[PDB]
């Protein structure tokens, strides 16, 4: 509907709602493979279901942008893609495990 997003290289999407729903569903699908007690899984599932609920309840793009407070709808789509990629990488990394190694006895001391 709008001519440009105002940002160089960011094209306008004619179907924001469907793309956002697809991306959020894929993110939720990836998070199901993460352990239930993982702190990463709970927070991003919470925020994704919060944002997925907003897109399923507001059909107007301008009001959806106002409600999401994430910039423009194309920026929201790009952020959803980044979150999906991060979820996949964290699934590969598994950073919910206990600390790899405590530092030496005096490593963050200051002044020294």
Partner 1 sequence: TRPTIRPRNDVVHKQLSAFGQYVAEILPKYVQQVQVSCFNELEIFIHPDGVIPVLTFLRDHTNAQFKSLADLTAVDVPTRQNRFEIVYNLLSLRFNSRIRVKTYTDELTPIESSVTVYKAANWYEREIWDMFGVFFANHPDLRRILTDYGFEGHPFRKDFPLSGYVELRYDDEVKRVVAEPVELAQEFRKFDLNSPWEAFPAYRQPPE
Partner 2 sequence: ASATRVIQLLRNWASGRDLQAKLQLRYQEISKRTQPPPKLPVGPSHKLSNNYYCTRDGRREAMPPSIVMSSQKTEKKAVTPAPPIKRWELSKDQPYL
Partner 3 sequence: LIAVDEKLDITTLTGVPEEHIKTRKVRIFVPARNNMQSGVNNTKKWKMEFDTRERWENPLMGWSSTADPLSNLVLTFSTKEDAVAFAEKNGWSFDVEERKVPKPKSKSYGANFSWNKRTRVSTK
* Residues near partner 2, by CB under 8 A: 42-44, 46-47, 69-71, 99, 102
Please, which of residues 45-74 interact with partner 1 by CB under 8 A? 47-48, 51, 70-71
Please report where in the chains the tokens 């924001």 appear, as a residue: 16
Name the residue nearer to partner 3 (CB basis): 37 or 107. 107
Q: How far apart are the first and last CA of the chain?
A: 60
Contact 56, 49 (CB under 8 A): no
Contact 78, 86 (CB under 8 A): no
Which residues form the interface with partner 1 (CB under 8 A)?
39-40, 43-44, 47-48, 51, 70-71, 79-80, 82-83, 85-86, 89-90, 93-104, 106-108, 111-112
């Amino acid at each position: 509907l709008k001519k440009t997003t105002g940002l160089v290289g960011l094209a306008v999407c004619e179907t924001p709602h469907e793309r956002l729903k697809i991306l959020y569903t894929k993110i939720l699908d990836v998070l199901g493979q993460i352990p239930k007690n993982a702190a990463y899984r709970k927070y991003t599932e919470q925020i994704t279901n919060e944002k997925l609920g907003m897109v399923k309840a507001e059909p107007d793009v301008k009001k959806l942008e106002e409600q999401l407070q994430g910039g423009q709808i194309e920026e929201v789509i790009l952020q959803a893609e980044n979150e999906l990629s991060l979820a996949r990488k964290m699934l590969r990394w598994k950073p919910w495990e206990p600390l790899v190694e405590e530092p030496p006895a005096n490593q963050w001391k200051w002044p020294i």
